[PDB]
Every structure is written in C-alpha cells, then in structure tokens.
Design a protein around this ligand. Structure first.
Ligand code: 8E8
Ligand code: 1E8
Length: 290
C-alpha cells in the first residue's frame, strides 16, 4: 500500500491516494509512462511501469538504464530517479518529469532554435556525456534531439530511454567499420552526433537533405563535406567553430569531450545569462503539440 519518493532532498511516504494520474507523457517509443502529480508536494513526476511479464530484453535495458540513473544523483544534466515501487507483478519507477525533447521543440518552432538556447544545451549535454563516460564508463551511442530534454525551469538534461549506452546521426568511421559485430568504438562518434544535432536544431533542417533512404544518408556522410553551420543566419564565430570541430570527418582528429569543454563556445555559454525557462514556457504556451 505504501512507497517512498525522494525529491528535493526529502523522503516522502506515498500511497496511491497521494498521486493524481494526469495521463500519457506523449508519443514515445517506450510506453507505459504517466505524468502524475504528487499531492503532498505539488511536483508532477513521470512514472514508468515495467511489467514482470514484459519482454526480457526491454526489461534488462530498463534495469540497466535505471542502474545508471540511480548512480547519477550527482549529475545535474541527467534525469533523476525519485523512487521505485515493486509489486508482485510490476515495477514502477518515478522519474523527474521534463517538459519535452529538442526534437519536439524543433517541430513546435517550425524552424531554427536560437543559438542562445543551443549554447546552454551544448554545455549541459557535453557535461552529461562526459560524466557518463568518466564516472560510469558509459558511451551513450545515441545523441540526437529526441534524447535532449528541456523543462520550464530552464534545465537541460540528457536521455537514453538508453542512457546505459539512427543512421542519420552516424559518424563516418562507424558507417562501414572493420568489425561491426564486435563494435568496441569510442566517444568521438557521439561528438559527431552532437554536431549533427546542433546543425539540425540551429537550422531547423536535418542536414542530410532530401535523402530518400538510409543508405543515401550514409553516402552523404561519407562523400560530402561536413554540414557546417551556414554563414547567413548570424551564428557566432564560436558556435560555427564548435560545430566544425564536432564535425571533424577524420575521427582521429575529432576532439573528445574534455577538449570540447575548453572550447570558447562552451566557456561563453557557461557564463552567459540565458533565460531558457521563460523562453521554453513561451514556446510551449504559443505552439501546439506536434
Ligand atoms: C522527444 C521526447 C519524447 O518524445 N519522449 C516520448 C514520451 C516520453 C518522453 N520522456 N521520457 C521520459 C522518461 C524516460 C524513462 C523513464 O523511466 C525509466 C526508464 C528506464 C530506466 C529508468 C527509468 C521515465 C520517463 C521523460 C521524462 N522523465 N520527462 C519528460 N519526458 C520524458 C520522451
Ligand atoms: C494512479 C494511477 C494508477 O493507479 N495507475 C496508472 C499507472 C499504472 C497502474 N499503476 N500505477 C501504480 C503506481 C505505483 C507507484 C506510483 O508511484 C511511485 C511511488 C513511489 C515510488 C515509485 C513510484 C504510482 C503509481 C500502481 C500500483 N501501485 N499498483 C497497480 N497498478 C498501478 C494504474
């Protein structure tokens, strides 16, 4: 009858009468996640259900991502777990509820997301990815706008549910690798995905234009110059250089996170006051659900 949620440094007793079911979070690839209000605090949280009867694989992956989240309590850029509740037949996982993902913001904006926002997102996501690798040995392997979450507090956090570690975002060196079935590669492939994601969000346009097939996209990644930010949109020199470095085609010359964290783009966005919160709220208030 009773579980526990820890939020804001405080542990709370929670019975079902304490939780208001506010419905689906939206069109996921996951399912069985609800937005719920915790009546004792007014926090709205996300609750994911893992059925004991569910697919072994899907469940093993959930548990692995959960393991990482539980050990990531010291990272501001990873979505936090508030609690778990195990019944005979299910496990419920309470998570910090974010507003939406960058993929959906792009759709709402019907175009470019401002540099200022993308700068703050870059700082957060690089730090999240770096944290994952350095603390937990996790190489994300799926950095894309759908895994970048924002909220109306102005927080920016990474996602993976997959955090335990998509041809469009594939680095060159990963396209026809020496050993694809024994895929022991490094974080530079994720750096490339980040650069793609930034160009896509900065332009409003996924950079591999009018490709009809996944293979055709891969041909573009290999044959074409990196899809650098355009020169005609008022992008800063630091943002353009940051994206160019991320999109270094030769992976041996592409920077790692520790080097990216020194980039002027990051240094400037660490210090720049940007009201991501108000901006997100305006967007969500003026646009419709994709
Ligand atoms: C572009 C983003 C998007 O479309 N979606 C689909 C709808 C849900 C949204 N989203 N997911 C979470 C979330 C992920 C995972 C869990 O629980 C969990 C799974 C495995 C291992 C540990 C925990 C719960 C929620 C979101 C959260 N927290 N907030 C907002 N949107 C979220 C992704
Ligand atoms: C109100 C919605 C409701 O009932 N629902 C909709 C969702 C699927 C079903 N569900 N949900 C729970 C449950 C369990 C825990 C929890 O919060 C936590 C509290 C502490 C730690 C972690 C999570 C919230 C809801 C649940 C349950 N207990 N038993 C059966 N079906 C359940 C039916």
């Amino acid at each position: 009858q009773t579980g526990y949620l820890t939020i804001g440094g405080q542990r709370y007793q929670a019975e079902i009468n304490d939780l208001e079911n506010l419905g689906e979070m939206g069109s996921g690839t996951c399912g069985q996640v609800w937005k719920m209000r915790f009546r004792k605090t007014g926090h709205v949280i996300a609750v994911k259900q893992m059925r004991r009867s569910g697919n072994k694989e899907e469940n093993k992956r959930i548990l692995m991502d959960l393991d990482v989240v539980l050990k990531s309590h010291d990272c501001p850029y990873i979505v936090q777990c508030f609690g778990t509740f195990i019944t005979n037949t299910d496990v419920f996982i309470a998570m910090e509820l974010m507003g939406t993902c960058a993929e959906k913001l792009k759709k709402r904006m019907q175009g470019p997301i401002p540099e200022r926002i993308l700068g703050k997102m870059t700082v957060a996501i690089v730090k999240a990815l770096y944290y994952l690798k350095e603390k937990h040995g996790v190489i994300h392997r799926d950095v894309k706008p759908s895994n970048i979450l924002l909220d109306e507090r102005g927080q920016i956090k990474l996602c993976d549910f997959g955090i335990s570690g998509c041809a469009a975002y594939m680095a060159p060196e990963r396209i026809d690798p020496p050993d694809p079935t024994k895929p022991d590669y490094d974080i530079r492939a994720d750096v490339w995905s980040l650069g793609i994601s930034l160009v896509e969000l900065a332009t409003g346009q996924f950079p591999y234009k009018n490709c009809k097939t996944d293979f055709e996209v891969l041909t573009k990644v290999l044959q074409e110059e990196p899809p650098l930010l355009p020169g005609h949109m008022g992008f800063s020199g630091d943002f353009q250089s940051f994206v160019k470095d991320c999109l270094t085609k030769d992976h041996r010359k592409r920077p790692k996170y520790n080097k990216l964290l020194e980039h002027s783009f990051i240094k400037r966005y660490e210090t720049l006051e940007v009201d991501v919160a108000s901006w997100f709220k305006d967007v969500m208030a003026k646009t419709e659900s994709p």
